[PDB]
Amino acid sequence: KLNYRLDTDPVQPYKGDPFNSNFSTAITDSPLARAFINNLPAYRKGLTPFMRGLEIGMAHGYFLVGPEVVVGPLRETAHGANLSGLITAIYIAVSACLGISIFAITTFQGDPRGAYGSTSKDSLRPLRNRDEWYQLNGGIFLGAMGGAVFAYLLLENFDALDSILRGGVNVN
Amino acid sequence: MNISDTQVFVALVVALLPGLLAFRLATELYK
Amino acid sequence: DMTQLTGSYAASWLPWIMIPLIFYILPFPVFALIFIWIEKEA
Amino acid sequence: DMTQLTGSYAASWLPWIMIPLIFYILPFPVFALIFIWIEKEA
Amino acid sequence: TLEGQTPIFGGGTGGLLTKAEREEKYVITWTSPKEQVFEMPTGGSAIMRQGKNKLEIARKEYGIALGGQQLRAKFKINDYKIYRVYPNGETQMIHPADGVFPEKVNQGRPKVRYVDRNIGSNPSPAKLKFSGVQPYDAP
Amino acid sequence: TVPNTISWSPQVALIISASSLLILLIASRSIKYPQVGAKLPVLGSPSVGTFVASMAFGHVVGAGIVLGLSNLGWL
Amino acid sequence: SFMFLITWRGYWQELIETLVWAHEKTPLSFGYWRDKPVALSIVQARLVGLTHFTVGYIATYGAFLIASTAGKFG
Amino acid sequence: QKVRVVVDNDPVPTSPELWAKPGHFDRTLARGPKTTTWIWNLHANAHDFDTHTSDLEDISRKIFAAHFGHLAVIFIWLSGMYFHGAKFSNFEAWMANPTGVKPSAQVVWSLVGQDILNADVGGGFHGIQITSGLFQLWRAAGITNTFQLYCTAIGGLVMAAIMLFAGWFHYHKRAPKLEWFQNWEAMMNHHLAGLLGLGCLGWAGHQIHVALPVNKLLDAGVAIKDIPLPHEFILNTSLMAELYPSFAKGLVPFFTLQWGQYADFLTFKGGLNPVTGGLWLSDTAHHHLALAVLFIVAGHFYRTNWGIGHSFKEMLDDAKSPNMLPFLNFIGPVGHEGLDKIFETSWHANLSIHLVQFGTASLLVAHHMYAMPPYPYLATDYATALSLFTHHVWIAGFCIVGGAAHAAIFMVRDYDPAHHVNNILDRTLRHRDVIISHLAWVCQFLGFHSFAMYCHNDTMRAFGRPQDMFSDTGIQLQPIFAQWIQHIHTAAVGALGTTAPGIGAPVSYAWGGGMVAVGGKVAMMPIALGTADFLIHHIHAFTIHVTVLVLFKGVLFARGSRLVPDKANLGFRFPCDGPGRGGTCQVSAWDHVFLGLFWMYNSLSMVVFHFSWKMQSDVWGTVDSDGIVTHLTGGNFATSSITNNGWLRDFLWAQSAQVIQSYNSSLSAYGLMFLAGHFIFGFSLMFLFSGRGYWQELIESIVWAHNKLKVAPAIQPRALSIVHGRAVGVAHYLLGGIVTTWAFFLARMSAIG
Amino acid sequence: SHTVKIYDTCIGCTQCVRACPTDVLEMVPWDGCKAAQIASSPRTEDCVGCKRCETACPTDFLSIRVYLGAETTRSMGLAY
Ligand code: F6C
Ligand code: CLA
Ligand code: CLA
Ligand code: CLA
Ligand code: CLA
Ligand code: CLA
Ligand SMILES: CC1=C(/C=C/C(C)=C/C=C/C(C)=C/C=C/C=C(C)/C=C/C=C(C)/C=C/C2=C(C)CCCC2(C)C)C(C)(C)CCC1
Ligand SMILES: CC1=C(/C=C/C(C)=C/C=C/C(C)=C/C=C/C=C(C)/C=C/C=C(C)/C=C/C2=C(C)CCCC2(C)C)C(C)(C)CCC1
Ligand SMILES: CC1=C(C/C=C(\C)CCC[C@H](C)CCC[C@H](C)CCCC(C)C)C(=O)c2ccccc2C1=O
Ligand SMILES: [Ca+2]
Structure with missing residues (x-):
């Protein structure tokens, strides 16, 4: 007389284990969600840790310049606004990379505690070695600096780019 | 008097609905 | 003036960014996705 | 003029650099030092 | 290895976490006379099977709560056992420790942490300064 | 402007009588529990509860139709 | 300070447990606590709440004492 | 046949013996006090009926009888407002000059100088300016003299006695069985069509025949004495036709579905009446009339005894996957199945939902009454407008917290895991x-x-x-x-x-x-x-x-x-x-x-x-x-x-400034209550920041002194329980803060409003 | 870990053992009381410090005392 009706349940236990504190939902287990998340540079199969950090830093440093350019305290002048946005991205990224370094220093002593231990099976935290974290950190810093400067150069030359993207450079 | 900025933005958001449904149909046909 | 691309229509900045996006920004990443799709081992 | 921070005292360039150093340049490295100190395995 | 069939459960958010895979985990096994609905210690309802069941739980208190307040008190099931499982695979049965429930006196059990006096005769802390001995641990 | 309402005429009687009759044909053969309670041909032999329900709903739907038509100049 | 003094520990420990679950199940969050996050102890909460209460007590009155006297005099 | 009336005859004898047995309802409290904690437990568990007994039928009877008692309390309170507005008010003076007279219905005696609170409210009257909006409500109802208010006051007292007798009758004489209380479909049909529907229709009748004619004359500028009594608009049909021509056609347009003829008194204008600033009474009459039809129709939705209608169980058992919308199928293959068991047995679950919806209703009342003022001379009475919004906002907040409180009580006490297997409640x-x-x-x-x-x-x-x-x-x-x-x-x-x-x-x-x-x-x-x-x-x-x-x-x-x-x-x-x-x-x-x-x-x-x-x-x-x-x-x-x-x-x-400078004036009571609220707020912090362990030890030394003088009580003094100290702290905290804002709002508006 | 001590005023009512939510206590043979049994705490490593045992103890003063000590993962009641 008891019918759990699990066989016809739209939401299943995650990965077939009902006692792993997770559900099989559209966000966690749909084919598109898995394809997108598992192919981000943090999870893409076969990537070296440095190459993971390079792509992550490139994307994050690029967009971190923007907020202070538009609503920052130097927004009244274009040249000052761009510099403040570049410095803000540099300061944030260097602070993050410093935190990543001290994370690697403190986490990987003996057998790491928590999700980075030898017997841990955290599929969402696959960087299990201290060397991988330092290689990732090098890519994060260099990518963030390059992405921030790339946004800085485009914003600094915005008058040239605006003429470029309108064909105004074809007058002469 | 052509359409306004709000109408263009509304059409862009509305077009997302057939965009997501086209993806759902394309993947379903791929099965 | 007729020395630049302009638009009197609403949100004329949209072609300013959408033409580069579809035609020479996104297509190479799109080709990369298709190339990965058609080369995946069984 | 009263549009900028200035100093009529000697070496008024000292607050120009010491305030950034103590308050938003060195404190994060100092926190990193303390964090490493309080997390070291026995 | 621990044998038994897991109760019918569709999944929940109160299950095991990283601690189960890193430090320790607990398993409670019991035999039921019929298929019936019980309450999971961390929320939700599960269906225990006809035969012998096996449930993985994050803390030892979950097993004592489930076995003591539900299996014994409500379902009249008195054969539940709690095991501690380590990541290396070592499994030890911890409840009931000697096969007899603790509330029932059993021969051969020694007195542990027994103080041969009433609690009002504990020495003052001033007498035990710099010795490292607490008043309740004093002879 | 106030929506137009027409004086009583055989057309409004026809609409209400027809709406009640169509509902009687449908309800006696479509609702979940007809033939419940005291009994009253082509109909499925509806009960007194089903019949009163159909006539009451015929007044509700009929009034909506006649008011809607008169509002719009016969729609 | 009223938060530390009125609300007590067990409420926050249960809330922290929920945040612990969220962190473990969120992708791209590579950080992980070396020290397990727990709610402040019962005694610690009284001390922390008393510190905020005292600091707010001194700061509020000190600002009022200086401003109400210096604003009306030298 | 399924819906029927089943009761028990004389289930509880009517005797005052248990009046002299405090704590008789609780097994622990029945033995009598040994410590002062017993006294607090008696009041804390007084109305926790499900802990008095485990019989759901006996619990439900207590709910039914006590609800009549609370209705009697409301009727006494309503009778007080009507009586005070008929005996100690300037209502008649206010009706003549609504825009130049402050409403007042409370007058204080002169013994300790408190007669200073009898403010100059205009109309040759001295009293406390009220902010409840009673005068504006009564004027919109067509009331013009204190005699009509006096009659309503007497009627309220009579209804209070009837309510009190109903509770005694339906508990001590004819108490319904548990099966009677579980008729969801019958209760909804009677409360939709018969309570909300008939009440809207009855009030629409009062508005059309009394409120609109009286208010139309009032807004035209005629004197109070020249306005005929409300029953004259029913007897002399010529008067009612002068005000609205369509009444010359009688009931013919209604029965012929020619309702457009009625457009002169069932208006659809919107906006506000320029004379008074309130909503058009003809607009509200058509509003309530449309509500009456909508509610009465809604009262034929549920299947009681004749096959026709919807069944709660069938509706709930169907709302599950895959019968849902494609994007709403995540609720699982059980869905709302099993929720019917909750409403069969849990009073707390129903109290949780209903308290939430009074919070919703009172919030709608607050927001919709300031922006669409429904009473004449209500919007311009700034003291009343602020008080009405603030009062109903606060009532809603307490009701919402009460809904969450009794939702938790349901989970602890009435929730059964066997009833909820992979359903939406279990999945949540x-x-x-x-x-x-x-x-x-x-x-x-x-x-x-x-x-x-x-x-x-x-x-x-x-x-x-x-x-x-x-x-x-x-x-x-x-x-x-x-x-x-x-x-x-x-x-x-x-x-x-x-x-x-x-x-x-x-x-x-x-x-x-x-x-x-x-x-x-x-x-x-x-x-x-x-x-x-x-x-x-x-x-x-x-x-x-x-x-x-x-x-x-x-x-x-x-x-x-x-x-x-x-x-x-x-x-x-x-x-x-x-x-x-x-x-x-x-x-x-x-x-x-x-x-x-x-x-x-x-x-x-x-x-x-x-x-x-x-x-x-x-x-x-x-x-x-x-x-x-x-x-x-x-x-x-x-x-x-x-x-x-x-x-x-x-x-x-x-x-x-108004409340801080109100001393030596008629607003000095608000100044005193402004400090009173501040005191209770600080007083509550003693209970919230401390613990009973300190206070129990302090009581030990105090008890020693009483023991030294042979005056120690037999009922041993105990510090408040840990929960009780929290309850006292939050009660005094909210009382102190709300009273402070109450005096702050009313003092300012009684001066500049 | 917390320290749980049992004193000689124990009457062997087994109420502390039944109240323990982590099975720290068990009843062992004894001769100091009529019940011929006394509470023991062999598994104090599993003690969380809830002091349910002290609440259940009927003697005055308590025959069982919990002294909160060094905090571990299982003494803090942590499932993570
Ligand atoms: C380390 C690492 C890590 C990570 C990664 O890796 C993380 C992540 C996550 C995710 C998942 C999420 C989402 C995010 C957000 O939005 O929020 C946040 C924000 C932020 C900003 C956070 C932050 C981030 C990071 C930290 C970064 C860092 C960097 C820097 C810069 C460094 C610097 C250094 C120097 C030396 C100073 C979360 C969260 C949460 N948190 Mg969590 N984290 C962590 C940390 C931490 C700590 C320490 C604490 C304590 C304070 C907490 C807290 C918290 C709370 C309360 C909450 C909530 O609510 C949330 C949630 O759950 O939802 C759902 N948490 N996080
Ligand atoms: C049309 C029929 C009808 C009406 C009007 C009501 C009205 C009411 N019921 Mg109710 N009920 C009904 C049928 C009806 N019931 C049936 C058939 C059942 C069985 C399924 C129940 C079972 C039931 C329970 C179990 C409970 C109620 C409760 C209530 C009260 C809710 C509180 C409220 O809103 O105060 C409204 C405020 C008022 C002042 C309304 C007037 C109150 C009097 C008694 C109504 C008299 C109307 C009567 C026709 C005389 C009209 C005179 C004149 C207009 C001609 C309310 C008085 C609750 C309550 O508080 O009980 C006391 C409660 O717990 N009812
Ligand atoms: C229709 C509304 C309604 C009903 C019928 C109930 C019914 C019930 N509630 Mg409940 N509640 C409600 C609304 C309601 N509540 C609201 C709106 C809230 C939010 C504040 C709560 C919060 C609440 C809690 C937190 C608890 C209950 C509990 C209870 C149960 C026992 C009643 C009790 O303890 O006696 C009441 C006895 C008292 C001594 C209270 C009187 C003291 C009040 C607080 C003082 C009020 C101050 C006054 C108005 C202003 C100042 C006065 C002046 C002299 C200074 C009972 C089933 C208790 C329970 O065990 O449930 C199972 C419980 O713990 N309720
Ligand atoms: C404890 C004494 C003390 C205190 C509270 C301050 C306070 C301040 N100094 Mg200062 N200063 C001091 C002694 C002190 N000074 C001495 C002795 C010197 C001569 C070496 C200076 C030279 C100095 C310069 C050149 C400047 C300041 C400035 C400032 C201001 C910003 C902080 C800063 O940049 O620090 C800068 C601090 C130093 C350069 C050296 C400080 C040396 C003292 C002795 C360290 C004291 C450590 C302390 C006792 C340990 C704390 C223990 C902990 C538990 C609290 C601030 C008002 C800046 C300013 O005026 O901004 C407007 C600035 O540019 N100070
Ligand atoms: C003004 C006093 C105050 C403040 C600031 C807070 C703040 C908070 N309470 Mg809280 N609380 C208070 C009084 C206060 N409470 C009182 C009196 C009570 C008793 C009833 C409670 C009871 C209570 C409960 C029961 C709950 C909270 C919750 C929360 C959190 C809500 C999330 C949030 O707003 O994040 C944003 C944070 C803030 C707005 C805090 C101010 C941040 C400032 C403005 C910016 C700081 C800039 C920068 C970071 C400074 C760094 C400088 C460096 C040197 C340190 C937040 C930490 C809830 C929670 O934890 O949910 C997540 C919760 O459940 N509180
Ligand atoms: C939608 C319902 C509704 C609305 C908007 C009104 C509106 C009005 N009524 Mg009215 N009334 C109603 C229902 C309603 N009534 C019912 C059901 C009765 C009894 C049967 C009455 C009896 C009544 C009397 C006796 C009087 C009024 C008066 C008034 C006017 C004064 C303002 C007021 O009451 O606050 C407006 C109220 C609201 C904005 C909201 C409250 C209405 C209910 C509680 C909403 C319930 C929705 C709920 C939260 C959702 C339930 C959950 C959902 C699953 C269904 C105003 C025009 C007075 C007047 O003279 O008019 C000028 C007056 O004297 N009314
Ligand atoms: C999910 C999704 C989405 C989102 C997205 C995003 C979020 C994006 C972003 C993006 C980004 C944010 C990007 C960025 C990028 C970047 C880049 C591309 C960069 C580059 C750089 C460079 C190239 C540099 C260079 C350099 C160096 C390295 C050094 C020297 C100098 C220089 C500058 C040269 C959406 C909603 C849409 C839709 C749905 C889905
Ligand atoms: C909310 C609230 C309130 C209230 C208010 C009011 C004012 C209400 C009202 C209500 C109402 C106002 C109701 C009513 C009802 C009614 C009814 C219920 C009726 C009925 C009727 C009938 C039943 C009829 C019958 C008849 C006869 C007799 C003869 C002929 C036939 C016929 C059928 C027609 C208060 C503030 C107090 C409190 C708080 C809350
Ligand atoms: C003050 C305080 C007490 C002490 C309060 C007690 C013991 C209650 C005292 C109630 C008294 C006896 C009620 C009567 C007071 C009236 C003012 C007496 C009127 C006398 C007339 C003659 C005027 C606690 O017990 C407590 C417990 C837990 C947390 C916080 C606290 C807390 O803060
Ligand atoms: Ca060129």
């Missing part, structure tokens, strides 16, 4: 960490992006950098979606084009369409929304979401958590599970209600503060002959409310 509990973690995150996002931007504004303003502030003149945060709705609703009536052509005036002038003035004061005008309104509305979003977080965590974790897995066995209301596990203080669902009460107070205080300041700044004021409006606070909301220094200075400090 199984992803409670998902819900609470996301709710915790959005609370932090809202707190950072609502309150911390106020701190940003304070720092920018202090720096002398107004251009960097979040303001209309700096970094703008325009509430474009709310502005768009105002434009849509204004263009709907003709003031997404004309989507409501039938309404002439704007539905509410708060959205636009013009300004209405009555006695040289603004009744309603467009309420523009800018950056300051964007910030304050997201303050409301933040505070509400946190109050939800506190209460909803308590309900979802009432059974237990990862910390204490067996809280359900510990009960709904227990102090803790000891200092172990690091400390488990206030884990029970009861302390989540206790903590949620503070957050409801904090949230609602800013709601009534937002209302009070915005209305004084941008709506209320005086209109000169040229149509120029000077507001009560001169439009300072836009620039001063964007910082909490502006709230501290321009709202709390500036607007408290």
